[PDB]
Amino acid sequence: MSKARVYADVNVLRPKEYWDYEALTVQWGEQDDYEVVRKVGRGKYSEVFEGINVNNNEKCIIKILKPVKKKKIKREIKILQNLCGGPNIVKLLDIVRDQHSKTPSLIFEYVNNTDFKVLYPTLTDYDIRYYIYELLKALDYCHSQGIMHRDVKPHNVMIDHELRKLRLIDWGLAEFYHPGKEYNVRVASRYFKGPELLVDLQDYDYSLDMWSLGCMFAGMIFRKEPFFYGHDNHDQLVKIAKVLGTDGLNAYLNKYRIELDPQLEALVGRHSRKPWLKFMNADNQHLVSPEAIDFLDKLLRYDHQERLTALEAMTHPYFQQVRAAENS
Numbered sequence: 001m002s003k004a005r006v007y008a009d010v011n012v013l014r015p016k017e018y019w020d021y022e023a024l025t026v027q028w029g030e031q032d033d034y035e036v037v038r039k040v041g042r043g044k045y046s047e048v049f050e051g052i053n054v055n056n057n058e059k060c061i062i063k064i065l066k067p068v069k070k071k072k073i074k075r076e077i078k079i080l081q082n083l084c085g086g087p088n089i090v091k092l093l094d095i096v097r098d099q100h101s102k103t104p105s106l107i108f109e110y111v112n113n114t115d116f117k118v119l120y121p122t123l124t125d126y127d128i129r130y131y132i133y134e135l136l137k138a139l140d141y142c143h144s145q146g147i148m149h150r151d152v153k154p155h156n157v158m159i160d161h162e163l164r165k166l167r168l169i170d171w172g173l174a175e176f177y178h179p180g181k182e183y184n185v186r187v188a189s190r191y192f193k194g195p196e197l198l199v200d201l202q203d204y205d206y207s208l209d210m211w212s213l214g215c216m217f218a219g220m221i222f223r224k225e226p227f228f229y230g231h232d233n234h235d236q237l238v239k240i241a242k243v244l245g246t247d248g249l250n251a252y253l254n255k256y257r258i259e260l261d262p263q264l265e266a267l268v269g270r271h272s273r274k275p276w277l278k279f280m281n282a283d284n285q286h287l288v289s290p291e292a293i294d295f296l297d298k299l300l301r302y303d304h305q306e307r308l309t310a311l312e313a314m315t316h317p318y319f320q321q322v323r324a325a326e327n328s
């Protein structure tokens with residue numbers, strides 16, 4: 001029986017309307033209010049376009065949804081509404097639908113993002129500390145609001161490097177946290193899935209996002225995108241084991257009385273733990289400070305209960321300069 005070490009009773013103490021997203025009655029706006037300029041992205045659940053609000057002539061992002069169940073769509077919407085206004089949380093501006101097809105679109109604020117594949121390599125030591133701190137503000141906020149993002153990855157972190165503005169986007173996989181509830185482990189993305197998902201531990205919590213965050217952080221400081229380059233879910237777990245070592249994995253599995261599928265156990269095998277410094281090189285040396293390593297190490301732990309919470313992460317000495325600059 002696992003539960004979150006923080007914010008566990010958030011949804012318990014709030015009115016049922018807050019988390020009972022299926023009781024949501026969607027209020028639709030006018031679909032002609034937003035004109036499509038051009039496609040900018042996509043997902044297996046939608047098509048994303050740069051658009052313009054015909055009212056104020058301001059930019060916006062139009063996320064057109066592919067056939068999706070009523071329940072699933074109400075969840076994303078409710079979550080977006082519950083979080084609207086929080087630190088660095090993407091803003092849902094409108095909700096429209098095509099009358100004939102019933103194709104729904106979610107209208108969001110626009111961010112002049114730069115492909116992380118091109119942006120990250122240019123980020124300075126301080127830039128990394130800065131943006132990660134900004135992302136942390138978003139995570140602690142949603143967690144404090146009883147919500148797990150469940151899909152943290154560079155692709156869901158929009159960044160306008162010029163304005164140094166950051167937004168955590170796409171809450172399509174997010175869920176409300178309820179103590180003891182068993183969730184679907186088919187969430188998050190390849191490379192960023194936490195061990196709990198890879199070993200089928202369903203009663204996970206906000207800590208899942210902290211593993212994803214750690215993967216992101218590791219890729220940034222080590223200049224290796226992605227950090228854990230695995231193919232399928234079994235392989236993804238093996239890639240983690242060859243770094244963190246199988247001892248931690250075994251201890252982890254034992255603590256939660258989890259038994260791996262025979263085939264998987266065979267693939268994982270036996271591996272020793274590889275120090276984080278083994279990943280340092282002339283390409284990333286100017287980023288692998290001991291503080292960076294200490295922070296990373298406290299994020300990438302098999303045991304989700306051992307990981308730093310977002311609140312704790314923000315106070316780590318690694319961010320001391322970012323904070324000092326903010327508290328002034």
Ligand SMILES: O=C1CCCCc2cnn3c(NC4CC4)nc(nc23)Nc2cccc(c2)N1
Nearest residue numbers: 040041042048061063108109110111113169170
């Ligand atoms: O949930 C969403 C929509 C996010 C809207 C926020 C949002 C804000 N800017 N933005 C940008 N800016 C880039 C064009 C300059 N791209 C995407 N989303 C967004 N892309 C995108 C691509 C695939 C999926 C999603 C979003 N997912």
